[PDB]
Symmetry: D2
Subunit: 115 residues, 4 copies
Amino acid sequence: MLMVKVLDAVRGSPAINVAVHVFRKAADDTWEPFASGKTSESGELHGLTTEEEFVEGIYKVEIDTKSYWKALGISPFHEHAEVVFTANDSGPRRYTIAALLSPYSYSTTAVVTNP
Amino acid sequence: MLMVKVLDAVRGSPAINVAVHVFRKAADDTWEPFASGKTSESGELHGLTTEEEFVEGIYKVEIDTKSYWKALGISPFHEHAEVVFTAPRRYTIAALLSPYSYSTTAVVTN
Amino acid sequence: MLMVKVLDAVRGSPAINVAVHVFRKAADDTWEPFASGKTSESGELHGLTTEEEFVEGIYKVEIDTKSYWKALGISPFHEHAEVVFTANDSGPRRYTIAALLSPYSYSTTAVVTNP
Amino acid sequence: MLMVKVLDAVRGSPAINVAVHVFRKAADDTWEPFASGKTSESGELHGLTTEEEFVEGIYKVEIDTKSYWKALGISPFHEHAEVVFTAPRRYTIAALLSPYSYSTTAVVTN
């Protein structure tokens, strides 16, 4: 129900091998590790969670943009990109978090559909 | 009343010396030249028009992004970027450039 | 080999029923109609062209953003969004043209992959 | 040396009266408050720091986008927008806001 897609705006391609970490805000206001992975050759990361596990709450997706650019020999501006949102407050949805990367800029968009 | 600002998302800087051409849709259905220039060291282009000459109508702003990227030794995707709009109204047209993506935003104030 | 995807940044959803017209620049510097369609419930438009037909050249994709916003009761800034590019100058590629729409802003991104 | 500019992509206007909070990463690994304010009628926030206090380090700029959209009667997706960067250097951090998408760009000049 949670998918991440990363695109490279310099090369016009999927962003491959980008580390992604997902956290859920605990009752004590701490970030608990929730899931992680790396984008595939299509720049996508699936299978982060299940419907039973993906309960109502505030989630943070942290995308390691810095390592990505370093490996291309580019010194980027941001340390990482993070996306923080309340999920599921009126029932289960499918969430797609898209990011579009340039060295000194990024865009992030959410597409939310009802399964 | 019409201002263009261009930013480079790759180098984190104003996009300098970018060519911009502005057209107005004519009585028939043709685009007649209206103004043009090149962005300054701050990536801005001002003084394209006056309140008297800037009448209601449809305008097209064409930004030569291709020549900009070629000068930097980067192969771009687009031939150019075009913004077409009907014309309160001070208009700032902003464009943020990457080689395979651009965004454009209008800020309209009174 | 040419696909168009349109997203709505106000609603966080695919942009459905957006008219798209594709043109190819002729030898005499005129725009010849090449293909058209409307985005599906996923905000995508496939099947615009074939590999044999999609020859080297300059193509223009015109997306009718204005009609889309009008039908939602919103008066938008742009008349339409158009994307103009040289295609296929070093061999056949798959082209995805993505657009992200807000009433006073749009973004367009190209993803080019080798089939 | 650090400036924030926020634009509203829905209404085509500066994003006015948006709360911004700036933090510096401390010796340990904590974010200690550094500066804050609200954007002006032009969607800008200036005078957050001085050249003496703005030393090398990692900084986080947090933009309260959620409160902005709620005031307009629009349900937004994000809790806020964060920009984290290592700190030439006049820094303009620009953010362009829509309810379900935002972009952020840095313009860094000397």
